[PDB]
Amino acid sequence: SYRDKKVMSIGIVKELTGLSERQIRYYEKRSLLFPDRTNTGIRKYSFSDVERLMDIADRIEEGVQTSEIRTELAKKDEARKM
Amino acid sequence: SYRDKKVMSIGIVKELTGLSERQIRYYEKRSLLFPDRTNTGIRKYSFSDVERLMDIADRIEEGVQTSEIRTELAKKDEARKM
DNA sequence: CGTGTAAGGAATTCTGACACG
DNA sequence: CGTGTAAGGAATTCTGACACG
């Protein structure tokens, strides 16, 4: 159950994903991932979010807009619940 | 492999374990766990360290000195490698 | 449209110490 | 011996903006 527990701040994610804080916080602004937040506002990510970020980055490179990606991901969640 | 990846700063550990930063940093000073460190000195813990902390706290409550605990844990590592 | 940067501040962690015991 | 606290500073994150495009 460790995979989905939100426990690592943005700095760690930046390293694990090789992405800038600008990119990471933006994808979230595009509703591509929903990190948790501490009462003091610091964003908390889980290992699952770390991978989600790598998928987003992959599609971004392949010249894909967040919207398209946002849809792709949406389709993947309904099936997971099945 | 998420279980052992060092990714969460002391604040998160404090919450997950209900232990004070004083206790956590001390157990490490007693060589009861070895957190990673970022180049900027911030300590990094893994889910495995989180559990290790709960075992330490458990024995501490049962009136056990870190030394004894340190030994108990030592014995558990050799067997794991087997 | 995705992303880089400088800006000012708010919250986090770190270390060594004094304390009691 | 394990742990609480105040102290001063160093590093982290957050947000909104200007930029190009």
Q: Which of chain A's residues 12-71 bind strand D, using a 7 Å CB cutoff?
A: 12, 14, 21, 25, 41-43
User: How far is it, in rounded angstroms, from Cα A63 to Cα B16?
Assistant: 40
Instruction: State the CB neighbour count (10 A cutoff) for residue B26.
Output: 14
Instruction: Give the experimental resolution in Å.
Output: 2.6
The experimental technique behind this entry is X-ray
Looking at residue A73, the DSSP 8-state letter turns out to be H
Domains of chain A: 1-82 (1.10.1660.10)
Nucleotides of C under 7 A from a protein CB: 1-5, 10-15
Judge whether A44 and A12 are in contact, CB under 8 Å.
Answer: no
What is the distance in angstroms measured between the alpha-carbon CA of B52 and the sugar C1' of D1?
A: 21
Token pair recorded at residue A69: 């990606």
Sheet holding A36-37, edge to edge: A6-8, A43-46, A36-37
Instruction: Assess contact for B31 and B70: CB atoms under 8 A.
Output: yes
Nearest residue to A66 via CA among A55, A77, A76? A55
Residue B8 identity: M
- Distance from first CA to last CA of chain B, Å, rounded? 19
Protein-proximal nucleotides of chain D (any atom < 7 Å from a CB): 1-5, 10-15
DSSP states along A29-65: HTTS---EE-TTS-EEEEHHHHHHHHHHHHHHHTT--
For residue B41, the tally of other CB atoms under 10 A from its CB is 6
CB contact under 8 Å between A2 and B38, yes or no, is no
d(CA B65, CA A72): 54
CA A15, distance to chain mean position in Å, is: 14
Shortest CA to C1' contact from A38: nucleotide? C11
Find all residues with CB under 8 Å of A41, minimum gap 6, and list them: none
Q: Which residues lie below 8 Å from residue B9, measured CB to CB, with a gap of 6+?
A: A8, A9, B42, B43, B44, B45
